[PDB]
Ligand SMILES: O=C1/C(=C/c2cc(O)c(O)cc2O)Oc2ccccc21
């Protein structure tokens with residue numbers, strides 16, 4: 001190695017052994033240190049080196065002479081030697097320069113009695129060279145982190161990182177490696193493999209088995225961790241469906257059927273109600289054909305709410321999409337069971353939050369911010385602007401008409417509404433510490449939903465005066481149709497929502513809005529629940545609070561409104577109009593919800609959008625931008641246990657907790673900066689080795705038990721796409737690719753060695769729990785392991801347990817800024833060093 005170009009015989013490597021080199025899989029890197037036969041204690045005395053006397057390889061060796069010059073110029077400037085060397089410069093001059101630097105390095109080592117300062121200096125120097133930084137990884141692509149590398153299936157130099165799999169972009173749309181001819185709403189292959197960080201190979205049968213193992217662990221967390229059967233997760237969210245092999249959907253579906261019997265009846269299904277985050281318009285019909293074993297979002301209704309109500313006044317659509325642009329056309333929804341089950345929302349922890357922070361940062365701080373890779377300080381200043389925009393009548397960045405969106409989400413038939421934490425409480429600050437201006441209106445709607453919201457739905461779109469309004473009516477419990485005359489409970493249930501999306505709305509003196517309440521509501525007293533005022537929304541918490549504002553239906557069951565009742569407003573809460581009316585005389589404890597039956601299911605689907613699923617409410621119970629806890633009583637899971645009576649009062653039946661995995665701290669993405677739980681190194685570390693952002697493993701256990709004590713189900717966020725920040729390095733044969741895994745031609749990284757962080761400790765929760773339940777699962781549920789998965793043609797393979805993650809179980813990684821030449825070669829032979 002160390003050539004006849006220095007003080008050899010002194011600076012040569014101690015022995016031909018591997019305990020003398022800092023190596024990665026027996027290869028050397030530009031940041032590799034080594035143990036020389038002799039060190040030079042200060043610039044003074046050559047002494048025999050100990051086992052603790054490692055020194056930078058770059059102190060005494062260089063890949064080319066060009067690099068030695070670069071090293072001398074750099075290390076002179078660092079150590080206070082204003083001598084520069086230029087284009088012309090013999091080997092003898094630079095070897096003399098290299099000695100001198102060597103001598104002063106050793107002097108500073110003895111002065112400070114550490115090498116920490118030199119680790120940094122060598123690192124900083126290495127990152128100045130194109131072959132050891134981003135410049136050899138360019139050009140960047142639309143990957144969230146600027147690009148990715150794909151690990152080669154057959155690398156002769158790295159056979160330990162080989163795979164017979166790494167089958168990419170097997171989305172629901174593209175599961176067979178061809179576009180599914182059945183699903184035509186999305187032209188595209190319906191997603192892409194490389195999203196973030198280390199991309200897990202969910203096409204590998206051994207990894208599939210391990211994803212099921214993790215699923216079983218989460219669904220038995222209570223039993224396994226705390227020997228407590230009251231502290232298990234009831235259900236899952238499947239994170240990033242469009243970025244993983246869709247085989248995982250048959251695996252998770254089969255498990256819910258085999259383990260929880262969700263296929264038998266609605267009681268079983270509704271005790272384990274599991275959701276997808278699946279953005280392709282193909283994913284809902286895919287999931288329906290697969291057996292409604294889980295439910296997807298209604299993306300169409302989300303876009304209809306966003307563009308009809310939430311957008312600025314000049315970017316706002318007409319209101320008719322609120323009726324027609326959804327999985328369910330709500331003109332006249334009179335069905336006992338909707339065709340397809342779904343959940344509905346206007347915002348989520350990611351959707352229409354991090355997007356708005358990015359808009360603010362890009363507009364008023366850093367125009368060159370990459371994807372969602374924000375700094376904490378960018379976030380804090382963005383939130384100064386955001387929090388002011390929330391309280392403004394004229395909003396530049398934040399949603400208009402939040403209460404109008406929730407009035408529709410919480411009265412609509414044939415979808416499970418999901419309330420976002422950050423619409424009731426502030427997106428920043430401590431958990432449940434600060435209420436939004438919309439908290440009252442949303443709370444009032446949640447309590448009214450339990451008491452009044454049942455039966456058939458009618459929505460109408462009336463052109464009035466200069467613009468338009470919509471009416472949305474529920475007929476009341478037992479009344480699917482406008483002609484049903486109902487019983488006593490029908491009479492005191494039902495609701496009328498009236499909305500406009502234009503602040504200039506003025507009815508003519510001649511205009512009337514006739515709202516059919518249904519044949520159970522003839523000649524009846526009605527009172528307001530919400531009314532738009534000049535400064536916001538007045539909530540009425542009882543019949544008596546509203547005593548002065550009572551109005552009546554006529555003999556046909558119609559409420560009638562005029563200009564006196566309806567006009568456009570502009571205030572911090574309403575841009576248009578909102579009016580919500582309920583019948584007078586509901587008992588204090590009236591509850592028109594319905595439980596799931598044990599009657600056998602007969603249509604081949606697990607989940608059914610009937611009155612019992614319509615009775616459920618989902619709560620997404622975190623924000624990305626929650627402040628870190630300063631003391632135990634501010635930990636979210638401790639606050640959840642303390643406030644569990646609130647959630648029951650609101651009719652929350654399904655509590656979607658944040659992912660509970662201990663966050664990585666690399667800061668390479670938003671998730672790793674605000675530590676939400678989506679960026680992790682250990683899949684089984686649920687606040688066990690260290691608190692998560694939300695508290696300790698014991699705080700989580702107590703939160704689950706508290707929710708269960710009120711009959712509320714708890715959802716585990718299943719995140720099989722990627723992992724962050726592995727502590728051990730590994731050398732892989734890699735190819736630069738776009739997020740679809742297509743090779744970027746004109747790249748130095750092409751069947752080339754590259755140094756990834758892709759090995760786990762072997763001493764973490766993964767090492768304890770990995771594969772630990774595969775024998776139990778194959779014994780109880782052999783059919784799970786008999787199924788030939790669609791993408792691979794073969795069953796899951798539980799014959800190997802994953803105690804340590806390594807490169808062979810991953811597709812690739814986001815580019816790490818280590819360059820195409822980071823692994824060192826002998827210049828003459830043009831081959832890599834191997835020990
Ligand atoms: O491509 C889409 C996307 C990205 C998306 C993907 C993710 O896995 C994620 O964690 C967050 C995202 O927002 O958001 C959309 C919304 C509507 C239609 C298409 C897209």
Ligand SMILES: [Ca+2]
Pocket residue numbers: 192193194195199200243244245721
């Ligand atoms: Ca992936």
